[PDB]
Design a binder for this molecule. Sequence first.
Ligand SMILES: Cc1ncc(COP(=O)(O)O)c(CNC(COP(=O)(O)O)Cc2c[nH]cn2)c1O
Ligand SMILES: Cc1ncc(COP(=O)(O)O)c(CN[C@@H](COP(=O)(O)O)Cc2c[nH]cn2)c1O
Lengths: 334, 329
Amino acid sequence: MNPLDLIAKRAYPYETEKRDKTYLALNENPFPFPEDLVDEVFRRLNSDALRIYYDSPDEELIEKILSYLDTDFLSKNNVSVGNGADEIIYVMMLMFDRSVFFPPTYSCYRIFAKAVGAKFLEVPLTKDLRIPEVNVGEGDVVFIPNPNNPTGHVFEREEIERILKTGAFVALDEAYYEFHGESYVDFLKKYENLAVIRTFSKAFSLAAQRVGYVVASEKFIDAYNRVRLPFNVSYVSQMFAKVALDHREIFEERTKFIVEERERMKSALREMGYRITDSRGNFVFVFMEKEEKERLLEHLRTKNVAVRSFREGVRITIGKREENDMILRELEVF
Amino acid sequence: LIAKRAYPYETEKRDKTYLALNENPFPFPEDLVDEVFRRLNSDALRIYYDSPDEELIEKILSYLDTDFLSKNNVSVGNGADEIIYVMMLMFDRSVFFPPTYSCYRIFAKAVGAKFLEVPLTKDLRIPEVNVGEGDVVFIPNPNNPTGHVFEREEIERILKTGAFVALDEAYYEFHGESYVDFLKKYENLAVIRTFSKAFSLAAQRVGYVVASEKFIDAYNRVRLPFNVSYVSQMFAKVALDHREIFEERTKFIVEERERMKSALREMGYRITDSRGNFVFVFMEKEEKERLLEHLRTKNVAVRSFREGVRITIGKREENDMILRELEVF
Ligand SMILES: Cc1ncc(COP(=O)(O)O)c(CNC(COP(=O)(O)O)Cc2c[nH]cn2)c1O
Ligand SMILES: Cc1ncc(COP(=O)(O)O)c(CN[C@@H](COP(=O)(O)O)Cc2c[nH]cn2)c1O
């Protein structure tokens, strides 16, 4: 009884979001999952398959993932899935002795670390958003989203490479890979102490279905597979990811619109005089002085607009054109 | 090094007639499947959807049909498995009694949780043990893989101990009696249920928990925020809105179970008094190996355990061939 309250008080309280009319605070894709693809999924659905325990990493889903990665060195043994990239990170924290990340970073790193009671360390990035000096080695997992959350800034190659050389296991969280070009998947050829985490959540408009995947060494994937829940991804969720990848041209078009919308907003913000990051994610970040930031949030709240607030300022997710314009119009006049 | 305490993952090719995973024998209804996609909002697939959704809690509550539980007493997991997995991250030590669910050992090792396996007595009764606050005791009732039911007294004794009881009612629909009413006295209890067996929804991963508000609150802070997909929650909701179609299937399942139980006894086999959706046949290992091979020859798969085989109830035909097979054996 008493120790359970001790469990609480150690982790952040569970809360749910109350979405405003124009929600741009969770990096969700602006467009719904394509309706004809939902119908495709409905049609490929074998009602008899619902009653069975369905191989979470589906054999054909791995194939599609491989296909998508389009490398010449990967095999099914280098890939696995997660109930969202969230679970991959979560279980990864169960696997290593200590988790290491650098704020500003994906806020769930801290939450999940405290949730599972894992030992972790937060070393802040330089004022230049560069990876600080740190003492890590085999035993630690270093979580590096890249593009970074919520800055969306892209780290330099020697930066990851440095951590990589320390023998520490790097978990390159490529949650925003799709909205940026590069990917360190190829690095899997030189380093074994690395894992690339992806999701269907941002570019495939499937955040509600929870599908993440990991590309890494056979030894890691095997380890991961022994630690994760056996059936972590539903038959229907996998079906959504497979259909999704069968029509990637569709989402390539949406991603292009998102990026073209990101740069448009980034340009407009500079013109207005705001300090912003060189975000390669599906969002933009604005540096603001607390007091002027708070003033901006109150104004936006008055207009049913929700963005993500941060110590450094605000993170704005890219939405539909009329939402992006709205953000610009309210920022202009303020 | 990335050691793993040697315990791989894999699912060999399921034989044609698969009776080894306590899976419902019937497909999810075609029309409920239709209803699910009917209520499917495409715009909601792109957002992060409250896993324990509000309507899902209302439905569950309604299905539990009690006079005290409120929304605060219920939560959900990505399969009953996830609820077990997270609970093991919440307590100092996990205690369970073999023969018991094989995944308790697996998830504990996997989650690095301290655990103690104390075998049930020779009469399948909860053994005497030193447990109290800090400890969490997993008791499936009906038990897996025997299907036998533990007496209320048994559960209560562990409860008085002050240790937390994780009452695993994965097979409840086939038994008919829950100890969820115990939440009126003990706060150190959680009942766990699933949609995988009685609702032919094993593939969609939806489990749920009924416990004290303090426990629900701590559980909700340790689990993944969005552990149950939007569509999975829809599937559970429609299943509950048509709960009578599954009670019919379940009635059939139990008939079949009792029918096989009489025939096996008659044939001379020693069995447990299973109240789940399967039977348990005791077999002296060597001969068991014989059956397994034989069945392997007929494309038939059952589950093998140290004391025998657990055969899941399938369609009337599958059951018939099973009785016939055990007969000619
Ligand atoms: C007693 C018990 N508790 C929980 C579960 C989980 O059900 P879900 O996660 O689908 O909601 C189960 C399910 N049992 C099996 C078979 O068990 P065994 O043959 O390993 O002893 C199905 C299963 C689930 N995860 C792996 N296998 C049970 O029985
Ligand atoms: C860096 C990073 N990694 C993983 C994920 C999630 O992947 P999945 O959806 O497959 O689990 C995210 C997503 N970011 C979210 C917004 O973060 P914020 O609360 O700090 O603004 C969405 C989210 C998902 N769970 C909680 N929040 C990510 O950015």
